[PDB]
């Protein structure tokens, strides 16, 4: 499944690729928590439904931070 | 839970922050599939166990690509 595991004070960058039925595309960037950032991307997509129809989305990861702590 | 959902031809960037018992740190970057990139990060961490002890890790997301397709 596609699951975002929230962390406090997270800062995530969302690159949205909008692909229209005729093959044309548009890209936009959103930043903030994963929840807020994706919400804005979806809200934007919704403003385009009137002229471009229903949309579906696939979320794919691109970057992570690994915090590795040694005990000594 | 922390779950990486694999996608074909994915290219993920891993930023590893190694935190030692005495407070000092070291950072490194790894790239490739999430699986390969994290594997290299862990392998690197293992080479430091002899002198720095056991390590634990927390994986946190940083960036995503959203592919939004309109049906028309
Ligand atoms: Zn999955
Ligand atoms: Zn979140
Ligand atoms: Zn997917
Ligand atoms: Zn979770
Ligand atoms: Zn993968
Ligand atoms: Zn975590």
Task: Please indicate the experimental technique that yielded this structure.
Answer: X-ray
Q: Which residue has the tokens 């229903």?
A: A54
Q: Classify domain B1-72 by CATH architecture.
A: Roll (3.10)
B14–A63 C-beta distance less than 8 A:
yes
Q: How far is the CA of B59 from the centre of ligand 5 (A)?
A: 14
Q: Which residues of B touch A1 (CB under 8 A)?
A: 3, 5
Q: How far is the CA of A7 from the centre of ligand 4 (A)?
A: 9
Q: How far is the CA of B65 from the centre of ligand 4 (A)?
A: 19
Element (H, E) at B17: strand B12-19
Q: Which residues of B touch A15 (CB under 8 A)?
A: 63-66
Closest CA to A67 of B26, B1, B22, B59: B59
Can you say how many angstroms the Cα of residue B21 is from the centroid of all Cα atoms in its chain? 20
Q: Which residues 6+ apart lie within 8 Å of A7 measured at CB?
A: B58, B60, B61
Kindly report the backbone phi and psi dihedral angles of residue A19, in degrees, each rounded to the nearest multiple of 5, phi listed first: -110, 120
CB A54 within 8 A of CB B72: no
Q: Which residues 6+ apart lie within 8 Å of A9 measured at CB?
A: none
User: Is A54 within any annotated ligand binding site?
Assistant: no
Resolution of the structure in the document, Å: 1.8
**DSSP at B70:** E
Burial class (CB in 10 A: 0-12, 13-18, 19+), A30: buried
Q: Binding-site residues of B for Zn(2+), please?
A: 10-11, 29, 35, 58
CB A52 within 8 A of CB B62: no
């Amino acid at each position: 499944m596609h699951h975002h595991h929230h962390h406090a004070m997270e800062e995530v960058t969302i690159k949205a690729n909008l692909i229209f039925a005729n093959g044309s595309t548009q890209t936009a960037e959103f930043k903030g928590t994963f929840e807020k950032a994706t919400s804005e991307a979806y809200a934007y997509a919704d403003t385009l439904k009137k002229d471009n129809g229903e949309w579906t989305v696939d979320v794919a990861d691109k970057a992570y931070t690994l915090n590795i702590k040694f005990a000594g």
